[PDB]
Structure formats: structure tokens, C-alpha cells
Symmetry: D2
Subunit: 343 residues, 4 copies
């Protein structure tokens, strides 16, 4: 029997949000970095990690020149950041919504080991997620992010890791759509190790097949979701070399064999790639001569903000300089998601 | 680990065949009717069922005017028919290949009850299927057909029926592609009963999701397959009425949520629909204002040959008349699969 | 490949605890009632719900006469209760361990709706469960309890409910055994509704089969677990009547077809049964003339403490009287789990 | 909903047969050797392979001294052998049933490669199996045998091999029980390769868990089945040495963690073990100090008939001598399945 998880109105608002985020030329900035990660990078830049340095840096990103308006379609925020105000006095959610962004938030609590496997983990944080999503929805967040991690290895990813992570993703997405928030499904496959494209493509296809079977079992409405996979690339330790067109063909091919066309958009990870290489690979993807029935765009945490971070140095007078670097990357990646970018 | 089921050459020949069959404007004639079914219909027309009446009728279909050449892309044959010759002396496989058709064959042995369920069946015939497919491949058959049946009911289709039929389909397709034959996956859902569109769409989505998960588990190469589903329609006993545009929207919607874009083409069943209604529904499908990343075309056993059969009457002098009727329908459905048909 | 989830020492301590709890003649008292439930029952008795009334009542149960020592093998506690002291000054964990009980605790956070189903729920609380189990392990708790709920209905339990609850149970048990705590798997099937034994037995077998497949997938060590199912009984609204021997035969039969013999013990729920009927059914179970390769015993929250509660009345001078009632039931159920009980 | 696969009468006849076969002290002789295998062994003995040599050899086995009556509970026959008569004139089915055996038959058609895996195979022969089982049932065969093969390897057995073979086994068993024939489920795991006990035990547990989940999904009646696994042993190429008590403990342990107690009996393979070693291992199994809730007995093709074969030499005057050897082994293994055997 069918007991519809969503009424037509709910479905309509979900699909509307999802189309706003990936609307042509637009992509997602990931500011979601937790105090641990942003602690690492603020230590890299040689500045102390304090609430004020974090807030100021995220002003540097969020307050950037209007030239980024037809670029950033959504901004993923960490919890704390939703409740911080810009020094002008506006809360960051209103700063973002004002210039046309959509607010996301990172709802997962991190990774937990799976016992009996080899270094494999699952993801955490389904408790109280519905009340949290209701609260974030009241606070202006229109989409959510959840990150599950899979590593290619000797005998890994195991069937248990794939099954379990797919199930948690689908359960997460169910809750989010019940509360009116577009889930972004992120089954990241770590580049670590030495493996050729063919194996990353094989594993990627298996993972995405399991993910969409799990989303079917949980009655997820696909027009109200986004997919956030990793580009198909060889491992860091792989000696063989691959042209960008081979990486593009492997990625698009892996997507066409799994992701059903109803999915609204596909927002790729940078995944430790070079800041410039990310936009080149994304461009090559959007130039692939196959039929891609969804929006292929970017969600870049590091690949957008690396140069801005290094150029800021933790000194406020560098502000303008820093932001300019950021703007550059944004524009570039915008061109990238349209296939019109050239270096 | 990956142990490729198919070498690049095998993949290339499979994708080439699959693109030939569904090439724009083209569809499939299903002549596959077994001696039992064709016995029923030859009794309906009031003629005795003999090898000669069958062979002659299939001449009536296969020898038809050249106006059907840019219409029929493939012809599904029953076993016996492959080994029958036209009275001109050419074997039917050469008659078909000569004017540009691709030869298929029906490889399943029929349905068997599943114990413990309510009237649910599975499909039979995986034994010796590889040797049979090698033989048919030598005899000119480039694609195969397998029919599995699912009925919507009170508590049916059960999880067991869906799982089992999906598994048998995937196993069938694996064998066929190993032998160089394009499998056509046919998970028919019977219209019998009274149920609104919404339930036929729900069930259809569940079935297709299970089918493509099973095809992923068995390492099937999707660019070398075709899908043959049934249009999403209310049951025969359903009192509520639906416009053709609603049926089209339900069908395309059910497909976009499941079938990945790599699948080459989708060839619909007529499924007991009226001879004219089939082409109207197919037209409305091809006019749907969504993005359909695959060829949507027809495989019609009855909806092509009904008028030709009735007009033939079992009298040889009626031959021309009969064939003309057939040609009409073919042309119509050709227009239908391009969206340009009007009644 | 195999990467053992547990070292031989860990396996040994788990199996030792599990054998202590179900050791012959012994069963479990469930004190785990949350402030909401115990709020209901303290309102039933006509006393205000306060931390002191709760603590005193649980003294009434835990401090009872030594005649219950070769009866209660374990005591399931709610969180708060672990940290409460008896007025003698001993913490309840030491009160229990002193007279030979094993301390359990209720680790689940309750039920959450599954969207898209009909009134079906899953269970919550896997977040931070490993740190919590480490803490409880330091505080003397040697086993954990998790309750998942399944209701028999028209088309329910659905495949999604069974799959999801089985997965959460297995994930829970994995974490608990990693921390050195014996999990008690409780897939309760609600008696609500009108259904004959045959359907409760069918559903019970399906659920337990899914549970043990899930425990196999998660690498659970079965000798270190306990099972806590519900007796197979007709629904409350079922008009047909069944002898206690039929209920016993249905229960033992459902267990022999699913639970593998490695499982240490089976501790039944009372499940809203009459206080006396629970021990009669349990007796009839232990008298069944089949081969039962595990300890069949009781975990009774209500069926032990009902008479004690009503006889206490919330008046301290009734203390002795109340405890005596409790002791009675304990002794009875002890006889019940040995098959030697008669009313 | 429940639609019982079997009526109580059917269930009763199935359980009765299954109890007759494994009745205490009794085991199964496997004569099922196909013309290919028996061709190999008749070539080993240096005799031509003809219908008459085969028939005579199977007289040598089936006509043996009455001392084997309280030993052999069932005899598995190949197809041809059912229709062969003893030179006394009695058909072999009546020869066997006369002295108290139960007739089985080998119903599988052999193994087929699974594409995309590494040397992994599935099993064949489900077509027309119901009519065949009806025929064999009319001819006196009361139980059936099906052999599926799994090899331990680097990354094998894969999830696909386990899933597929479990599904085929369950489908086979469903058909057999519908026709009134006790299926014997045989998921053989090949000893080939070098692997320690721990891995053979791990793999064995995974396989048996999948098998019984599949038998639950297909509504199999477990009291009407037998299990025929392989003893848990190191690979042939494994250098480490293991006492017979370690092999026994590993086998019984693997069984207690999977096989539910409802299963009637467990009949082990010899699996290329030495003729004497098989009975020693079986004895050690039946002496294991655990609780084994089912009959543990033998099904030995080679380990019974090796000495008889070699002693027969293909010379008719050796007949008596040959049979005596056979009788010896039978008696020994009878003692073995009671735990009372000593060498």
C-alpha cells in the first residue's frame, strides 16, 4: 500500500529549493568547517583559533563583492555560524539570503568505527535530527549536508560498509525532507591509496547503486535531493597518469550508469585536488560529449577559499586582497559549471 | 576487485546493436507468439492452427511493403520461426535483415508458481541458455526477450516476487551479454484488477528500482540493454478516468525516478490496450515536457497486427489487404515514437 | 577477509556475563521505567511523581528479602537510577551486585516515526553510544537493553520497518559488545489488533530471521547476546480462544525455526499479560515437549511489580507488605522458568 | 499476509521422511556419481565405462550384506540408476526400500560460470523441476540432492556468489517440498587453496547465514529439510596442522552460530578426505562437549566406497571381497555418527 511520505505542496517546495541551488551557473560554497578543521587551517595560516577569528574569516567569505552573486547558489554553514552576526549587525543567514544564496547546514555528528571491518567507518547523528531540522528550518536553513566516508582498500569497501552507510544516508534524507529541508547526499570515496581509475569507477558505481536503492526503500523524493559525489580519479599513490578528459569520461560514465535522471543536480567535491585542477576537471566534465540529464556543478570547501585564506594571512588590512582571490575562484568555477571555462 | 565481464570489443558490439534497434523512428514488432497463443488467435479468426498457417501469417507480417523499412528496427521471433523459410526461399532471418531489421528471439520457457505467495509466479528457462544463445547468435538473432509477470493485488507484489523476478532477469541478461546478444528486460506489471494510477506508479517504481539494483549486482552493461516496461495505467476494473496526458506524465515520471540514463532505449508494451489507444498514449509520452534521456519507442505484438489479422481472415487472396492494415499501424506508431503522430 | 571484532578475552567475558544472567532458575527484573511511564503508574497509585518517590519505590524492589537471591539474575535500570543511593548509603548498583544480580541499563532514546509507512516507527539513540557504554561499564552495568517496536497490521510490518529495525538492533549490539556489555536484543511485536496465533507466529518468524541475518552481517558474537522476544499470542481484539499449550507450542516453534542455538538465553516479555498469566504461559513454554537449546526465562517489568506496586499504595508503612507481594511473584516466575511452577 | 505453502499433511509427510533418513545411527550413501565422474573412477580401476559395469558396481553397493541395514538410512541415486534393475529382477528403488533405505536422487544439472567474478560458479537445473520431482516421487524417490559450489580465494566468495547460490538453493527446496520430496541443501565450500581454519569457519558462517535467510524468504519448512555442509578444515595447501578436536570444535561452532534447531539433521560431506580420516573427524564431531540440537551424521560418496571399489578391481569373482570392505566402512561410520567409534 502507499501512504505518501509527502503531500504535493511539500514536494513542490522541495523541488523549488533544489532548483534554486543548482540553477545554471551556480554552485555551493562549503563553509561548514568545524572548530577542529578550521583550527588546523587557522594554525596553518599562523593565527590563533578563536570565535572572533572564525567569525571574521567567514565575513571575509560571505560579505564578498557582488560579482559572486550569479555564482554562489548556496552556502553550507556549520552550526555556530548560523548564530553569528556580521559586524554590520545582520545575521549571516540574512547576509546570504539577501544576495540570493540558499542556506545549508552540516547536520552530521561525525564518523564512528564499524567493528569487525578494516578501518571502515559509518556516520553518526540521527538522534533528535527532526527537532534540529525544524529549528534550522525556522532559522533560515533550506538545505542540509551529511558526509559519509568510504575508503578504497585491499578488500574494502566491504558489503557492510556500503550497506550501512547507504542506510544512514537514506534515513537522514527521509528526516530532512519530512522537515522541509533539501538533503544533499554525500557518499565520499577517499582518494587515499594507489588505484587506477578503473577501480575508482567500479567502486563508485557500486556505491551509488546501493545509495539509490536505499533511497528507494525509504520513499525518498528524488526531485527534492541533490547528489554530492567525488570525481572519479586515481589514488594519490597511483603511478599511472590520466588526462583530464579521461577523468571526465570516467566520472560522467559512472554517473550515467547509476543516478536516475530525476535527481536535480550533482555537486562535486574538490577532494584535496589542487585549487586550479578542480575547475579544470569540472570544466572537462561539463564538456563531455554525452547526455547528462542533471545539473553538474561544484560544492567546493577548499578549492574556493584556499587562495583567499593564504592571502588573508590573519591580518585585517589584507581583507580586500583576500576577498578578491576568493571572487576569482568563484567566477572561474562558475564558468566551469557551464563548460565555458578556460585557464 | 574487478574482473571485467566484457572486453571493450564486446561492449562495443552490444552498444551498436542496441542503438540500431531503437534508432530514431524505429520500434519492435513482436511476432514471438507461441503455438498456444497464436493457437488462440488463429481460432479467433476461425482458421485451423497448423505450421503452414503460422508460417504464412508470419510471411504476411515479415514480407510487408517497403514503407515499413524506416519503422521496424527489430522483430522478435519465436524459436520455430527462425527455422522457417519464406516461399521465395529466403529464411525469415534474412528476410528481416535484408530490409534493415534486427532479429530477436524469445528465450524464456514460461512462468512457474511461487509457493507460499498469492498467485505470484516467477519465470523459467535459464538452463542451457548459454548454448542456446550461442546457437541463436550463429543463426542471426541479435537480441533476446524475456518476460516476467507481476500482478498488482491486495498484498501483492510481495517482496519475494520482486526479488526473485529481478534476480532471474539479471541472470538472464548476464548470460545473453556473455554470448553477444542484447537482452531486453521486460518486467511486465499486469493491468488486471482495479487500482488507480497512483498505485500502478508506486508499484512500477518499486519494481524498476529492484530490477536495476539486481542488474548492478550482476555486473550487467547497461548501454547494451533495452528496457521493455508497461505504460503506467489504471487497472481494467478501475472506475476513475484519466486523460492520456496523465498516463503519459505518470509513465515518464516513473521512468525518470528509476531507469539510469545509460540505458539505451525503452520499448513499451501495448498490454491489452486498444490498437489505436496504444499509439495515442505513446505519442503523449513522447510529447511530455520533461527531459527523457533515452529512446522511448514501441514493442507491440498485438497493437500492430490486430487489424492485419482480422482483415486477413485466413484467406490468401486477402493478403494484400491484410498487409496494408499492418503497414498503416506501423507508420502510425513510427510517428508516435517521434511525438509527431496525430489521429 | 576476517578482522576479528573481538579478541578471545573479550569473547570470554561476554559469554561469562551472559551465562550469569540466565543461569538456571534466574530471570530479569525490569526497573527501567522512564519518568514518563513511572509517572503514569505513580499517578495510577495516586502518588505525586518526584525523584524521592521513584527512588523509594526502587528501594522497595531492590532491597527485597534474600528469598529473591536465587531468582533475579539481572536488573535493568534506567539512567537516573544508577546514580541514586539507597538510604543505607549503598549505590543501587552495589545493592544489586551484592546479593548476586547483574546490572543492566536501558540505552535507547525512544521511537521515531518512519516516513512513508503506516504508523511504523524505528528506534533512536545510537549517537555517542560507545562513550555512554564505556561510562556505564565503569559504573557497574554489565548488560544493556534496547527496545524496538513492530506492530502487526493490515499491510504492516512493512519490509522497511523490519529491515531498518533489524539494522539498528545489530548496530546497537555491535557497539555494546565493543565496550564489554552484553546486549539484549528486543524486537517487540505489539499485541494490539485482532489477529490469530498463526499470523503472530508468521510475523515473529520473519522478524527473527531478519534480526539474525542482520546480526550476522555486523559480526555480532552470539554467545555474548541475549534475546528478548514476545511470546506468540493472539491480538487483544482476537475473538478466537487458545489454550496455554497452544501459545507455548507456537512460541517454541517460532523460536526453533529462527534463533540459532549459540544464543545464550531467551528472556520473554510479559507484554501487557495478566500478572499470573505470564508465569503460566512461561511454565507451559518450559514444559513443551520439544528440544530447546537455550535458556528460556523471564524479563518482567510489570508482571513482577504490579501487585507490589498496588499493595504499596505510596505509604511507607506498607513497605513490608508490598515487598512480600513482589517476592511471591519472583519465586513463582523462578519456578516458571524451570517448568516446575503450578498455580 | 500468510498463504501457507504447505498443508499440515504435507508438513507431516516431509518431517516423517526427514526423520527416517537421519534416524539414530544412520547416514546416507551417495551413489549419485554421473557418467563423467564414474567414468573417471572406472578408468582409475582400469575398467571400461559401460552401462553394465556401472549397473553391476551399483549392485555391489546396493545388494550388500544385511549388516548394513541399521547403517544406511538413505541412498542418493543418479537418474539412470533409478531405472536400472538388479539381476534378481528387482528395480534398485525396491532393493533399497526393501531393507529399509530411503531413495534420494540428484536433481541438479551442474555448474555454470558467473560472469564478472573470479572463477565463481552457480548451479543449474531449475527448469521443469516440478514435473521431474513429481515423476521421481512416483518412482519411489523420497529425497533430493542439489550441489552448489563455493571456493575460498583471495577476494572470493563474492557477495554475488553467496547471494545467487543461496537463492537457487532456496528455489530448489521450495519446488521439492511442493512435490513432497525432502530437499538436502548442500552449500559445499571447496578445500582447495591454502587457508587456516579461522578463514574456513568465517566463510562457512557467512554462507550458512545467507542460506537460511534465503530459506526464510522462500517460505521453506525447515523441519522437512536436511543440511549437507562440509566439515570446517584448512585448505589442502595450508601448512599449519590441526588436531581432529580443533576441526570438530570449529565445525560444531560454525553450525551452532547459524543453523536453527528446527533443521532435522546435518549430513557431512567427506570432501576428498582420507577414507579413514572422515570417520575420525565425524566421531570427534559427535564427541564435542557442546549442545547440538540436530542429528549429525554422514553422507559419504567416496569415503564409503573407495576400498570397495579398489578391492573389486572390475572382476566379478572379487564381488564378495569388495562388498565386505564397503560393509566395514559403513559400520565404522555408523559408530562415528553415534560418537562410539574408535580406530
Amino acid at each position: 500500500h502507499s501512504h505518501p511520505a509527502l503531500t504535493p505542496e511539500q514536494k513542490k517546495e522541495l523541488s523549488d529549493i533544489a532548483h534554486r541551488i543548482v540553477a545554471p551557473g551556480k554552485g555551493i560554497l562549503a563553509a561548514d568547517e568545524s572548530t577542529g578543521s578550521i583550527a588546523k587551517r587557522l594554525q596553518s595560516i599562523g593565527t590563533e583559533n578563536t570565535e572572533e577569528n572564525r567569525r571574521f574569516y567567514r565575513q571575509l567569505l560571505l560579505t564578498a563583492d557582488d560579482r559572486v552573486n550569479p555564482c554562489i547558489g548556496g552556502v553550507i554553514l556549520f552550526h555556530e555560524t548560523l548564530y553569528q552576526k556580521a559586524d554590520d549587525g545582520r545575521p549571516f543567514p540574512q547576509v546570504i539570503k539577501s544576495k540570493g544564496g540558499v542556506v545549508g547546514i552540516k547536520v552530521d555528528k561525525g564518523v564512528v568505527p564499524l567493528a569487525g571491518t578494516n578501518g571502515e567507518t559509518t556516520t553518526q547523528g540521527l538522534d533528535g535530527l527532526s527537532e534540529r531540522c525544524a529549528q534550522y528550518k525556522k532559522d533560515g536553513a533550506d538545505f542540509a549536508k551529511w558526509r559519509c566516508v568510504l575508503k578504497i582498500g585491499e578488500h574494502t569497501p566491504s558489503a557492510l560498509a556500503i550497506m550501512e552507510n547507504a542506510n544512514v544516508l537514506a534515513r537522514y534524507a527521509s528526516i530532512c525532507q519530512q522537515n522541509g529541508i533539501v538533503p544533499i547526499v554525500e557518499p565520499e570515496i577517499l582518494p587515499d591509496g594507489d588505484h587506477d581509475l578503473k577501480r575508482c569507477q567500479y567502486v563508485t558505481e557500486k556505491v551509488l547503486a546501493a545509495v539509490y536503492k536505499a533511497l528507494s526503500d525509504h520513499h525518498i523524493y528524488l526531485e527534492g535531493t541533490l547528489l554530492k559525489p567525488n570525481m572519479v580519479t586515481p589514488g594519490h599513490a597511483c603511478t599511472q597518469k590520466y588526462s583530464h578528459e579521461e577523468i571526465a569520461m570516467a566520472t560522467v560514465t559512472a554517473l550515467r550508469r547509476t543516478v536516475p535522471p530525476a535527481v536535480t543536480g550533482v555537486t562535486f567535491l574538490s577532494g584535496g585536488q589542487s585549487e586550479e585542477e578542480a575547475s579544470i576537471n569540472l570544466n572537462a566534465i561539463n564538456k563531455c560529449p554525452l547526455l547528462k540529464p542533471w545539473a553538474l556543478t561544484f560544492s567546493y570547501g577548499r578549492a574556493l577559499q584556499a587562495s583567499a585564506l593564504k592571502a588573508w594571512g590573519g591580518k585585517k588590512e589584507n581583507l580586500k586582497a583576500a576577498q578578491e582571490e576568493y571572487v576569482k575562484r568563484a567566477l572561474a568555477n562558475s564558468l566551469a559549471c557551464q563548460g565555458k571555462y578556460t585557464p
